[PDB]
Amino acid sequence: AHKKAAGSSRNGRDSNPKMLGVKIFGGQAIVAGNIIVRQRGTEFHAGAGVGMGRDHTLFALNDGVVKFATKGKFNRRYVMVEEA
Amino acid sequence: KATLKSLRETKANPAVSIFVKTHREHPANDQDPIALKNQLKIVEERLTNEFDKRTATTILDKIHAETKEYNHKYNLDTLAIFASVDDVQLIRMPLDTPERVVISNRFATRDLVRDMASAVHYYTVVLTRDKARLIEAANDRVVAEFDTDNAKQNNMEGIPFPIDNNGLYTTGDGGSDRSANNENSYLKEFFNQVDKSVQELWGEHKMPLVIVGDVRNISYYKEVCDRPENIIATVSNLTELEDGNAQRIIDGVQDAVEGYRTSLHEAALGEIDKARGANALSTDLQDVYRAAFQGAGETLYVRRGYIQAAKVDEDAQTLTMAVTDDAVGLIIEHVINNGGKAVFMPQEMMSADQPIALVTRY
RNA sequence: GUUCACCACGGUGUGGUUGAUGACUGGGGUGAAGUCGUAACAAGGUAGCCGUAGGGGAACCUGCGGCUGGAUC
RNA sequence: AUCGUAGUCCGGAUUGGAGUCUGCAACUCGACUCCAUGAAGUAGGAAUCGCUAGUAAUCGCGGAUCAGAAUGCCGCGGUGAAU
RNA sequence: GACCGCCUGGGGAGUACGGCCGCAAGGUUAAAACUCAAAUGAAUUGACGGGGGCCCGCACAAGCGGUGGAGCAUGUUGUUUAAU
RNA sequence: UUUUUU
RNA sequence: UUUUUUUUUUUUUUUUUUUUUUUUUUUUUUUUUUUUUUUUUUUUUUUUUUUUUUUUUUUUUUUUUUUUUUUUACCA
RNA sequence: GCUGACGACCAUAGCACGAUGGCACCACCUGAUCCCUUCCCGAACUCAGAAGUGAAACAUCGUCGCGCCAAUGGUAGUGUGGUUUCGACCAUGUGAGAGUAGGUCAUCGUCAGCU
RNA sequence: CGCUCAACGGAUAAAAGGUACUCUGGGGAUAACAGGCUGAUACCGCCCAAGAGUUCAUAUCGACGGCGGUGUUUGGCACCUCGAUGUCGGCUCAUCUCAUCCUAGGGCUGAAGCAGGUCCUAAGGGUAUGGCUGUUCGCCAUUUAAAGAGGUACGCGAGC
RNA sequence: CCUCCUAAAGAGUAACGGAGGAGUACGAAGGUGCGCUCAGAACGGUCGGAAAUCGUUCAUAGAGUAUAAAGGCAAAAGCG
RNA sequence: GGUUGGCUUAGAAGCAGCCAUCCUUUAAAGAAAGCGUAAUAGCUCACUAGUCGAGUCGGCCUGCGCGGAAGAUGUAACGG
């Protein structure tokens, strides 16, 4: 092992996947209760027709069509459920 | 001013150089005070004879103010005193010189010149089946040990010293069996890696190296060395290669270092012969002095204790036989001052019939 | 002349005695204002000394017997 | 009479200012005077000194040296113990 | 007076070596080189004793007041200076 | 009871 | 190498819990002494191996390196 | 024409600088009895009011100083098929970012009030 | 409500070792030898030229760096062989390579001569015996024109 | 078990790959209503300074978020 | 030709190194591009004039080539 080089650096940990991301994309039919976005924080904000859970899950409050839009003064990404 | 780089530049008048043979052990050093007294006696008498009594008295009181606290139980081989009208500098030397007094413009520094010309700076590679060490050694002292806290090992592409033999066979893994009898090959490759580190370090300094170790280890290393011409000595009777300290190792290599210095002095004879054949060697004291004073001599070869008094004048460039107390000292001073080299050859290698030679530049 | 006998040289072996040397080691002596202590000389601060044994860096200590070449009594 | 136990109406160093003398001359480097300031110091560790009676302790007053410059030296008396 | 033993400067040394004796510890017989001008005995005069006896002094004890802590005066050391 | 040295 | 143990005053050793640095021996100055010991009084004295890091605050918590000890480093 | 409320939109809408505005409106403003305020404070919140002023704020207007937006062309990358000296290249389909020219001192809706 | 059942889907409430005295079933699914792949390391070569060489980079040597060749050291991998491919050294007997040790031909030289140093060509032959140690090697003694470097299952145990 | 990367712009995705955390805390640090806005810098100011508290002016957050990291956070999810 | 430019250095004279690149006779001639000397010396070069007489010089890019290029049973690195 001639040059004293190889040695202890123990990091072989990693957490399990969380399966986040957009579940229902823009223009899709949706029924009330369907989860649209699983996220950490409000990467997307609930507009009209969609609510937010305690883990920032966005879900449909009513039936319709999912719409994504950027709006407001903060240029926030919003997801809406339009009655279409 | 305790150095050769200050004694040659302090050009006083009168400049008195006194040399006393001293002894390191008791009761040999019992007669060191008497020797000092006798040398100061002749110093006083000559100073009064050649100069005025007032200038002898000031110099002698200055010498006495420095020699009154001298401890003769800590004497080296020689006690040199360099006195002036204003300053006195006494130094102890491990060189042996013949007791004498030189009164001149400059301080008699040929013994310092000889001591500095005998200087050998070298590497010590200490080998073992389990490890390698590297020491830098000047003459008889260790300069450095080449451990973890060094600058010379900071940017290294090889294994830094001290190098452990962490071979797969030494730890018992790796893919080899003892019934294969690969141990000699393993030792050879380990010593090859050791030589790689040695060459990497030597490229930045380029000094000769002494190989210390078992006879078999030295053998393997010599067969594996990438620059075996730079090896000057091999010692195989040095003890405690792994635990003993660097000073102990350097103490144990001193016999081989002295043999190396002797070999260099033997080699100087061939260059003297080449100059003699090329008609560029002067051996008469007059010719040697003239060439040295006019800066024609590049190498001087003295016979290590060839003192000679003469009448020297730097107007007609003449040197008549006896005055200057050390005409050879003046020749050495001129050769060194004009950018030459001085070599103090041993008595058994330079004949007493021709005790001085000068290889000239033309 | 030959042969045998005696025998000098010389040879072989194995011892004895003794000179010079020998890594290393034991003590003795000399040499400086060295280090450690203070054992003895005063009752020397535990009287000392003799034999002997054990012990201890070192003078020494301790036991057993002996002596006075022991002061104070 | 007052102060009434306080770093004070204790202590008087140090510093600022203004002067008087002596002396050719007071910056280095004099002594006094005045005003202002007001420092440490609240009884002193280990240790250690003098004293047996007009003594110790305490209080002043002189002199030599000396133009000026004693808290030192040499003397004088006052009060005056303990053991 | 008879016979026997022993000494011949101090160390080295009652040691070494060799014998003999001893289980051993050791004993016994017993050198040399070298080294030093002394080493010793008895007595004398002193001095000294963590020897004895007797005695004195602010020596202690019994007391009074201090010094050692502060500031200042003065002297010394050390340091510093051209010199202190 | 505990006083080493020069 | 690996796993543990640690690194602090002159030395050898204590801490520590995030809110601080310790005995002892020294060393320096005193004092006793004819003078030195001994002894007695005073004192001084810590980048807490280094280096990132966390904290308002770290010698202390994390991480790295570096000395130290140990204990291991085996089968052909 | 202007002002205020609520919105669309979320910098070509912003910042900076300058000018205009007090008849309505708005804002400062006056006072602190009362409602209600202050871990203290009539600062803010609140109430009761019109002596003053458009100073500040605000609104509007002006500009290119900053910001912001931003082509065209080219380049990089890239799906598929092929080749390759493994850098890439060819055919086909796509095609940035940066940068440049340039643009920008917004545009609209509902209601009320003064003119 | 009671688990560092933390080997965290938790075998039992309850549990360490040794075997060179060993044994069975298997594996070239997987190590030790040798082959293969690779070439980091190694060895050899070349490029640049700071410097040393008294002057003078390039007679000789070549710092800092760069680029290759070989398979050749130390390694990496686990492809072959575990219904067996015997390990080191010696002996005997070899065979090949050339990066040449001697002998042969050369250029340069800090080549006067004698001796060398480097590099080019060259593989036809030749290329010690002993002391120590199991040694290969290595050191040492004495030689020789020289005592070459390697490959061949680190050639060769159905040859010892 | 959690966070980031590897992970090739949906998800998922391995290595004895590269980096860090967890095995809790809290009856308020939960609910609601109401209210508020941070860090830093400069200037002025008693002790008081580089930095305490006070006043002013800039300041989309360069702070905070019980804790690792990521993603979020002005209707603040931050602070009373 | 000033002139061995100055400095430095034993010596540094165009030519170890450091600091300028000036002037003069000029058709031209560097305070010198090399060899050389211990240093000078010496031999060349740049440059100019003459002779001859027609094309010539050196960089850049691109294609294909050359050297760099040594191995082990036998050619043995187009299968022949």
Q: Which of residues 4-23 of A touch B (CB under 8 A)?
A: 4
Instruction: Take residue B354 and report the two structure tokens written for it.
Output: 């021709």
Residue B73 DSSP symbol = G
Report whether B257 contacts B249 (CB < 8 A). no
Strands (E), B47-166: 78-83, 88-93, 100-104, 121-127, 131-138, 141-144, 163-164
Instruction: Take residue A48 and report the two structure tokens written for it.
Output: 């009209």
Determine the nucleotide nearest to B30 by Cα–C1' distance.
C32
Instruction: Take residue B112 and report the two structure tokens written for it.
Output: 């310092």
Report whether B350 contacts B361 (CB < 8 A). no
B27 upstream amide cis, omega within 30 of 0: yes
Count of CB atoms situated within 10 Å of the CB of B143: 16
Dmax (CA) of chain A = 72
Q: Which nucleotides of K are covered by protein (CB under 7 A)?
A: 9-11, 38-39
Counted residue by residue, chain A has a size of: 84
3-state secondary structure of B240: coil
3-state secondary structure of B158: coil
Instruction: Take residue B191 and report the two structure tokens written for it.
Output: 């010593």
Q: How far apart are CA B7 and CA B359, in angstroms?
A: 26
B355 upstream amide cis, omega within 30 of 0: no
Q: How far apart are the first and last CA of chain A?
A: 70
Q: Identify from B148, B156, B166 which residue to disrupt to test chain A contact, counting A C-beta atoms within 10 A and taking the largest count.
A: B166
Relative to beta strand B88-93, strand B121-127 is unpaired
Identify any residues that bridge with B231 across adjacent strands, giving them in sequence order. Answer: B209
Q: How far apart are CA B341 and CA B357, in angstroms?
A: 12
Residue B309 DSSP symbol = -
Phi-psi map region of B284: left, alpha, beta (phi>0 left; psi -120 to 50 alpha): beta
Instruction: Take residue B128 and report the two structure tokens written for it.
Output: 């073992």
Q: How far apart are CA B360 and CA A10, in angstroms?
A: 71
Enumerate residues preceding breaks in chain A (C to N > 2.5 Å): none
Residue–nucleotide distance: A56 CA to J12 C1' (Å): 22
Q: How far apart are the first and last CA of chain B?
A: 36
Who's near B237: CB < 8 A, 6+ residues apart? B252
Distance from chain centroid for Cα B277: 29
3-state secondary structure of B288: helix
Report whether B211 contacts B221 (CB < 8 A). yes
Instruction: Take residue A81 and report the two structure tokens written for it.
Output: 């459920």
Q: Tell me how close the Cα of A1 comes to any Cα of chain B, in angstroms.
A: 6
Q: How far apart are CA B231 and CA B212, in angstroms?
A: 11
Report whether B211 contacts B234 (CB < 8 A). yes
Token pair 């001149």 is at which residue?
B104
Report whether B144 contacts B49 (CB < 8 A). no
Report angle CA B204, B207, B213 to the nearest 5 degrees.
110
What does the DSSP assignment read for B97-115?
---EEEEESS---HHHHHH
3-state secondary structure of B222: helix
Q: Which residue of B has its CA nearest to A4?
A: B159
Residue B138, Cβ density class (10 Å: 0-12 exposed, 13-18 middle, ≥19 buried): middle
Measured in angstroms, the resolution is 2.6
Asked if B167's CB is within 8 angstroms of A3's CB, the reply is: no
What does the DSSP assignment read for B31-57?
GHHHHHHHHHHHHHHHHHHHS-HHHHH
Partners of residue B159 in chain A, C-beta under 8 Å? 2-3
Q: Is the dihedral of CA B71, B73, B75, B79 positive or negative?
A: positive
Count of CB atoms situated within 10 Å of the CB of B110: 22
Identify any residues that bridge with A27 across adjacent strands, giving them in sequence order. Answer: none
Q: Indicate the helix (H) or strand (E) that contains B191.
A: helix B183-202
